[PDB]
A paper describes a structure:
Glycan uptake across the bacterial outer membrane (OM) of these bacteria is mediated by SusCD protein complexes, comprising a membrane-embedded barrel and a lipoprotein lid, that is thought to open and close to facilitate substrate binding and transport. Here we show that for both the levan and dextran utilisation systems of Bacteroides thetaiotaomicron, the additional OM components assemble on the core SusCD transporter, forming stable glycan utilising machines which we term ‘utilisomes’. Transport-competent FOS are generated from levan by a surface-exposed lipoprotein, a GH32-family levan endo-glycanase (GHlev), while an SGBP (SGBPlev) is thought to recruit levan at the cell surface. Single particle cryogenic electron microscopy (cryoEM) structures in the absence and presence of substrate reveal concerted conformational changes that demonstrate the mechanism of substrate capture, and rationalise the role of each component in the utilisome.
Despite this, initial 3D classification revealed that the SusCDdex complex is intact, (i.e. a SusC2D2 tetramer), and that the SusDdex lids are open. The positions of GHdex and SGBPdex were initially assigned by rigid-body docking of AlphaFold2-predicted models into additional density decorating the lip of SusCdex. However, unlike in the levan system, no classes corresponding to an octameric dextran utilisome existed, which we attribute to a higher propensity of the dextran utilisomes to disassemble/aggregate, potentially at the air-water interface during cryoEM grid preparation. We did observe heptameric complexes, containing two copies of the SGBPdex and a single GHdex (ED Fig. 6a-d), together with hexamers and pentamers encompassing all possible complements of GHdex and SGBPdex (ED Fig. 6e).
Residue numbers in the entry:
A (entry chain A), B (entry chain B): 112 to 602, 613 to 940, 948 to 999
């Protein structure tokens, strides 16, 4: 069975698009959190990894919905919470269910617009008690590392750059070959990480009672020099039947985590000169020389990493108590109470040290505290009866309530005298101090009806009325109806058609968005000053949710004597009342620069999803496979404006651009043609400031003869079009082998790291791609010359830094064998990210949503061995 | 059965002094916390109430042991914690056991020197499930309120005082009778409190599993105008038998509390003049006039109470997981892990207001955070076998470990502009900021042996080795052996004799007591200054625990066909290695003013305890009774000094005094003889500065003719000698009546409130006892005259302010009757502190340990009605 919110339903009776992940999938994954364990295992959901331990992945369902927060809703044991997925132990997760179509997400009303993720924990089973012990060890190494120049090559490049600009060169760098090799910062900054995990739990069952107690421990070290992560978990579940008409359920969760790490930056490491030794002759940390144009101004990364310490602690508590009263055979009442408390603490300390480029003469300590409490209370009725042995009617109706509180505080001191003893009482000079508070509330009413007719025609209807404090006084309440249909053709072995339609909403618009902002002012009287309030950012009492309408069609098929399955889904999603920039009339007394928003935007998404599974080979050898494909298309309809929006500034210009009729986050820049070879080509070409031979030539889109801002166009679409995956499973006498494939094609990636690593206009270490630069006529046709300051602006926004993002990756290969009194015993060996096929030149093709790569944490490759016991 | 630590034992097999409180006692108590519910119910334990909601009572076992922290040790479900008793729900407490003699407290070693309190929670029972619902409502009112003068009487007193000192009087107070009555501050400051409590729980049982889930809510309002207290509780217990040789136990506890209250003071209320109206004609708060000698300088208490707000929140988490492995039939292994986390938060805010005596022109906010985490891990073996069907041997041995961490932080800001919006971001001026950290650890080894011989001779031996980080490097480890004997004469129906002897220790000496303190200094060089450290309070690497030796004798009897019981206990307790002030030689480079301590003090305590129970009447009427008596004597042997120690300064002099050969905290002051009647008596009496007719005459202890400091002696002993109580219970056809008596006699109380309320030397409101003062020759013989400034120092430390502390109180009278499908239903009516018989003149005879009363929270009288359901 599957969970669809406020109840359970069979898979065969589902009238919407519901996808589930079983225990058999998440059983030997070497990943830490559950988020990385379901990447590519489900259709219609895109998951992007992060890499840093303790972080969470990014989940997007059926493409981007708005230009605002579009993250889905996470529900844990019926409690909608904001807890991160990295804080949940994977060893005690039963199954994960994802709701995509509006026919199933309408039950949540004002929150189920971007999809709902359901997580269910394990429970005890009837019979004798069981004890399960698990362990795992792993090592991690970086996948791909860019190649940088050595001391001699950098010296030659610097000499060429300074000679081309008619500037004095380094007196002792006239013989680059004598310098040698130098120091590699990337090799010293990276190491091999070690990950170990342990878990133990026991469970039992009885016809009237059940119990389950778990607990685990995890320790992980990052691939960089100083990052650590620890996590402790504990969970207890219970279920008792007090009498015939009473029943109780209890779920408790507790977890802690500790995060460490120094001050580091990948960009600074990639820009550190290879001619500088790590340490001086006396052991002190080195630094750049006095001449900025010869040594740069990059502070030593290793010193900052090994001298600065950052720490963070967190504590999380989750509770859930559920009751149930049985009045008659066909009537039940259910009550549920939820609790959730979180705490955060931060601690930073920067010792005072005389750094060569910029010394630090003031040691400081930073601390911060955080709290948050969330409550829930749900009450609803359950009805189920059969009429004339054919008609089945199921009606559920009730209410819900939820509110939250938040607070924080931070401070800082200085001096501290001795570095070893740096408690808060040691310092004397206070630096900063502040805090605030926020809260919100929500109320709702729900009603759902289910109908069946001879197992040949199913009809479901749902209506929900929601009211939140985030909305204005004029749009406090709203209604989100829904309806779906499903019938079977059989009553080619089976066939089923599903049609649905519903309306949902999104309320992630922040808090206190209907209140203007005032700044304190004074008005001089004859001899006294009186404080006055000046209004700014006028109130908007018409702010409400964002409307989303969706239509879905589904087909279910079974072929070859119920051996293979097929699933086809086509959806059209429309977004209305999107928040966009508003227009402020001059007669209103305010200026247009005020940041006021209104519900006027629109967006449209559509695509097709596919799923196919085959189980062909049987007998001694068992072979299974699963093919998943997904297509999506994005389009922006209106933005309530006549001018495009420019965001995501890189360098001194904006990269992305938003315009009606085009996909989101599309690039916008110049187009490169070639390289100048002589003055004759420059003279007869269109005018261009700072033109010289060996520079990049830009095309003239408009026939005006002048290269200017108007010569820009769309470069590429960061949103991919095709998502695909493939899995295989073999089994023969205990031995089993699993191979998983995953890849994404149809997107472009903007490499922002190459802006400074290929510009050759500053004292930054370059990559190996600058060796074949333009040093004369006919020497090269793609790589320009080296010049200090870049008068021609060869590093501007153009198609030079745009690369294909399509890739195919071998995700996981796992081989395990099944073996004092014991019941079960298995040993597993697995690997992650064994190989990758792509044309991208960088750390990893996996980038963020808008396709911009700028000093991201590298993705590692993991080799692990497992172990599993069972008493 | 009873719990004695790391196991259980039958009551009949106990070889030491162990007392227990059953469920039948704590079943209808209207008190909030468990501490107030066991006052006088147990012999050898003294409990003093507090009165303020959310506070904890003071517990002392068999008299004071040291001049330092002598509070006992609290153990909850085998976890030694510092959690207050007010944070525990009384509805789910099974029984409370107290260990007194050293023969039973030696198992805890370095912590069981002042007694151990054991608290056990309820657990599920085999059979069908049960549901229990409880409710209670109550009201509270002050018991006794002192009587103060009115406007006319105060005006007359002020006129007399100013005329006797030859000073100008109030021009418009020449006719006191025209003033009227005035305002009573005590009547306005006090109200009637309301207390309500609810609880609900369910439990079940199975031959292999058990469970128990509880939860409650409590709200209480104090008798003063603005004090509130709320508490939420939740607890879940489980016990499962996975297989034949495995077993697990789990206990979880969670609780929160919120405390409020303004700025108030009983002393200021009792000193406010009755001629000042509460508010002015325009509604603003009133205040004292410009003339200090006519109106005083007492700020308005009502305004401070209603304008200043203080808030405090707390969160507590307690966990306990226990395992057990059975190797053979006569061998078992047990493991236990304990967790404990606490959080505190504070919030204060004082609005700026122009108070008449001292205006406040700066509004400030104060915040504070607290954390504390404690861990435990115990592992020990259990052996039990029978030899030759007669000899029974039980051996237990193992280890233990425990450590703790602590941290805190606080800050403050000012201005805040608007009072309504006072978030931390509003303020601009930082005021203060600080924090610190502390920790400790402990390790131990344990071993206990039990022997039996034909149920006629029992021998028990126990040895424990402890090591803590609080001790010096020279006394890291120690040993605490023990031994006891017991045999039965029968093998007058039964007879049993118990003899025991053991050595325990106390380690409540603080943290980092072996580390000297340094202060930063500078030393001027030729042109620069270098920081230097100056040593102070030299290190003491010889600091260790405090040794206590105790011998106990016990007799158990049964008379009249096992109808009545009797218990006699005699104990002698000696204290060694007590921490006292040390002597610093001049050659050591330090002064005598340094606060250094060493183990040199001694103390001795002894007494007799009695217990008697009768169940005489049977049949339709059931009558039961219990008589408890206790005698104790205290004595101080040595203090490693030749001069008495003076502490507890009141006014401008010290009251208490410590000296060898005398009890602790004994008073020390002058002795009053009478009142001067004429100048002839003054002239022929011993010299006395500021002598005048109508003043108090002090006796001359030494025949020197001069009244000076040497004319002081011991006034009284605050430590009582006799503790007694009596209880009765009736039952007839559901109806039951219970009457409980309790009283303490043999102690003196020093009334520090009368120092300012009877001195008549300042602008303070006086009590009604000043009406019959000395206004002429022969007018009075006890009450002196009224004079401004008190030249004779009539309010000095003497026997004038010493009153008898003996009292007898009617504690509780409870009447309850035993009555839709239901199983049980009862309605209960109860009262608390119905009447009190005493000669003390004050709020209540219940005072602190040293017998000093100074502006304490009044003790209220409670009337309550109960209700109990059972499904």
């Amino acid at each position: 069975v599957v969970v669809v919110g406020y109840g359970t339903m069979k898979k065969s009776d589902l009238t919407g698009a519901v996808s589930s992940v079983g225990v058999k999938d998440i059983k030997d994954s070497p990943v830490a959190n559950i988020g990385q364990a379901m990447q590519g295992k489900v259709s219609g959901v895109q998951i992007i990894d992060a890499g840093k331990p303790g972080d969470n992945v990014t989940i997007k369902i059926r493409g981007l919905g708005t230009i605002n927060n579009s993250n889905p809703l996470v529900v844990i044991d019926g409690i909608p919470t904001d807890l991160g997925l990295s804080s949940l132990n994977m060893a005690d997760v039963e199954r994960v269910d994802v709701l995509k179509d509006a026919s199933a997400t309408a039950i949540y009303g004002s929150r189920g617009a971007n999809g709902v993720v359901m997580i269910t924990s394990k429970r005890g089973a009837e019979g004798a008690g069981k004890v399960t012990v698990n362990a795992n060890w792993a090592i991690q190494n970086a996948t791909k590392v860019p190649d940088m120049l050595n001391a001699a090559q950098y010296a030659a490049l610097s000499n060429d750059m300074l000679s081309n600009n008619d500037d004095n060169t380094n007196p002792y760098w006239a013989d680059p070959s004598s310098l040698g090799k130098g120091t590699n910062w990337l090799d010293e900054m990276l190491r091999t990480g070690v990950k170990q995990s342990y878990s133990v739990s026991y469970s039992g069952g009885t016809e009237k009672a059940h119990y389950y107690v778990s607990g685990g421990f995890l320790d992980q070290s990052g691939i960089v020099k100083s990052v650590n992560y620890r996590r402790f978990n504990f969970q207890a579940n219970s279920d008792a039947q007090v009498n015939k008409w009473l029943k109780f359920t209890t779920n408790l969760t507790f977890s802690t985590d500790v995060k460490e790490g120094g001050t580091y930056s990948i960009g600074d490491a990639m820009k550190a000169l290879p001619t500088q030794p790590v340490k001086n002759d006396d052991g002190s940390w080195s630094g750049p020389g006095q001449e900025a144009q010869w040594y740069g101004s990059i502070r030593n990364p290793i010193g900052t990493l090994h001298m600065m310490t950052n720490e963070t602690k967190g504590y999380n508590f989750l509770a859930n108590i559920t009751g149930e009263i049985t009045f008659t055979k066909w009537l039940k009442l259910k009550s549920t109470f939820g609790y959730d408390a979180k705490f955060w603490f931060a601690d930073n300390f920067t010792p005072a040290y005389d750094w060569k480029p910029n010394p630090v003469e003031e040691s400081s300590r930073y601390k911060s505290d955080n709290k948050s409490f969330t409550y829930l209370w749900d009450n609803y009725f359950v009805f189920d009866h059969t009429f004339a042995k054919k008609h089945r009617v199921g009606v559920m109706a009730g209410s819900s309530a939820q509110w939250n509180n938040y607070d924080y505080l931070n401070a800082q001191k200085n001096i501290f005298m001795f570095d070893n003893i740096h408690e808060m009482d040691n310092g004397e000079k206070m630096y900063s101090l502040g805090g605030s508070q926020s809260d919100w509330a929500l109320l709702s009413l729900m009603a759902r009806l289910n109908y069946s007719y001879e197992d040949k025609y199913l009809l479901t209807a749902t209506v929900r009325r929601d009211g939140s404090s985030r909305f204005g006084k004029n749009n406090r309440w709203g209604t989100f109806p829904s309806v779906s249909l499903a019938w079977r053709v059989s009553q080619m072995n089976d066939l089923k058609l599903r049609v649905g339609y519903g309306v949902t909403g999104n309320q992630e618009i922040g808090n206190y968005g209907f209140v203007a902002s005032y700044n304190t002012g004074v008005y001089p009287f004859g001899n006294n000053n009186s404080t006055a309030l000046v209004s700014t950012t006028l109130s908007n009492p018409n702010i409400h949710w964002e409307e989303v309408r969706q239509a879905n069609f589904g087909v279910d098929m079974s072929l070859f004597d119920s051996r293979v399955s097929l699933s086809l889904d086509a959806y059209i999603k429309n977004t209305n009342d999107m928040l966009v920039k508003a227009s402020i009339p001059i007669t209103s007394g305010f200026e247009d620069t005020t940041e006021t928003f209104t519900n006027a935007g629109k967006m449209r998404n559509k695509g097709v999803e596919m799923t196919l599974r085959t189980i062909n080979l049987k007998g001694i050898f068992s072979w299974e496979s699963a093919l998943t494909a997904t297509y999506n298309k994005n389009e922006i309809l209106d933005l309530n404006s006549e001018t495009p929006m420019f965001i995501n500034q890189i360098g001194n210009s904006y990269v992305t651009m938003l315009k009606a009729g085009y996909p989101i986050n599309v690039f916008y820049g110049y187009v490169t043609d070639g390289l100048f070879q002589n003055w004759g080509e420059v003279n007869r070409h269109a005018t261009q400031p700072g033109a010289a031979p060996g520079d990049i030539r830009f095309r003239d889109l408009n026939n005006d003869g002048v290269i200017n801002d108007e010569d820009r166009t769309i470069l590429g679409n960061p949103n991919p079009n095709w998502f695909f995956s493939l899995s295989n499973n073999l089994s023969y006498k205990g031995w089993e082998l699993s191979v998983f494939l995953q890849g994404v094609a149809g997107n472009k990636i903007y490499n922002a790291n190459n802006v400074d690593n290929e510009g050759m206009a500053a004292a930054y270490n370059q990559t190996t791609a600058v060796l074949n630069r333009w040093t004369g006529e006919g020497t090269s046709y793609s790589m320009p010359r080296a010049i200090w300051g870049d008068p021609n602006q060869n590093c501007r926004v153009s198609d030079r830094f745009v690369e294909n993002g399509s890739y195919l990756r071998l995700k996981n290969i796992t081989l395990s064998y099944t073996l004092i009194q014991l019941e079960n015993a298995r040993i597993s060996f697995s690997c992650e990210n064994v190989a990758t096929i792509t044309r991208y030149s960088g750390f990893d093709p996996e980038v963020d949503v808008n396709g911009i790569d700028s000093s991201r944490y590298p993705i590692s490759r993991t080799f692990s061995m497992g172990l599993n016991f069972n008493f």
